[PDB]
Ligand binder design. Structure first.
Ligand SMILES: [Mn+2]
Ligand SMILES: [Mn+2]
Length: 257
């Protein structure tokens, strides 16, 4: 068994100022994937970039203090890829694809579309390039795990306000339709393997008591390819965990090598 946590951290220093290292120690995952780091390693306290028992890998954006993803793992991957080979997606610190030996791990921070019509086109194409990349890899024979902030609630059950947000980026027909197609390409949203209840979200707005009122979205997912789903034992939501506007999400898989 391998324990993997994904977490949009809303800035790595920001969360560190709120008990990140304590939490990380009590959870002891085998792999920790983080999104929205907002820093380069050289701007990070040394105790955030070197954690005992773990190996760190950082993928910052061209722009400083913007997005970027990180990976901590007890055992290091044989290599990391930091893009899809399409540069307008590869430079924003959004892609980490770590090759462990029993599987690939996609640590992805998918773009937000709310900003503008431009950023919507960008998010959707990012979705396409992503589909293309992941599909090439598993058709070639690789078992894949994809985690991270998709910035889209799949279904009505996956947010508190479907009706209100039918025309807001995050719950548009196009965006949810992409996830349907994603799943049609042979991929399973693992949480829904184990949990079919409503009121299960991973993000809440910092404003107007949204977390206390459970007015939230499920933006963070763990996907596996179909032919690998037998190996997943647990997919759950760490909703007690504070320190970001997202909470972390967990996966456990069984394998040898
Ligand atoms: Mn944020
Ligand atoms: Mn987000």
């Amino acid at each position: 068994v391998l324990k993997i946590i994904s977490w949009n951290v809303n800035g790595l220093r920001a969360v560190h100022r709120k008990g990140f290292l304590k939490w990380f120690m009590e959870e002891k995952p085998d792999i920790l994937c983080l999104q929205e780091i907002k820093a380069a390693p050289e701007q990070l306290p040394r105790k955030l970039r070197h954690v005992e028992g773990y190996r760190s890998f950082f993928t910052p954006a061209e722009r400083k203090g913007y997005s970027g993803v990180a990976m901590y793992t007890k055992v290091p991957p044989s290599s990391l890829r930091e893009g899809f080979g399409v540069e307008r997606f590869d430079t924003e610190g959004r892609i980490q694809i770590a090759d462990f030996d029993d599987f690939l791990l996609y640590n992805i921070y998918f773009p937000n579309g709310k900003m503008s019509e431009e950023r919507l086109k960008y998010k959707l194409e990012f979705y396409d390039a992503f589909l293309e990349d992941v599909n090439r890899e598993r058709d070639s024979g690789r078992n894949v795990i994809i985690c991270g902030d998709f910035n889209t609630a799949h279904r009505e059950i996956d947010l508190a306000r479907p009706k209100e947000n039918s025309n807001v980026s995050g719950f548009l027909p196009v965006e949810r339709a992409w996830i349907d197609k994603f799943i049609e390409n042979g991929y399973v949203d693992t949480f829904r393997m184990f949990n079919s209840d409503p009121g299960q979200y991973t993000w809440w707005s910092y404003r107007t008591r949204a977390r206390e009122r459970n007015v939230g979205w499920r933006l963070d997912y763990f996907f596996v390819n179909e032919e690998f789903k037998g190996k997943v034992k647990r997919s759950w939501i760490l909703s007690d965990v504070m320190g970001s506007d997202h909470c972390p999400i967990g996966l456990e898989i069984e394998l040898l090598e």
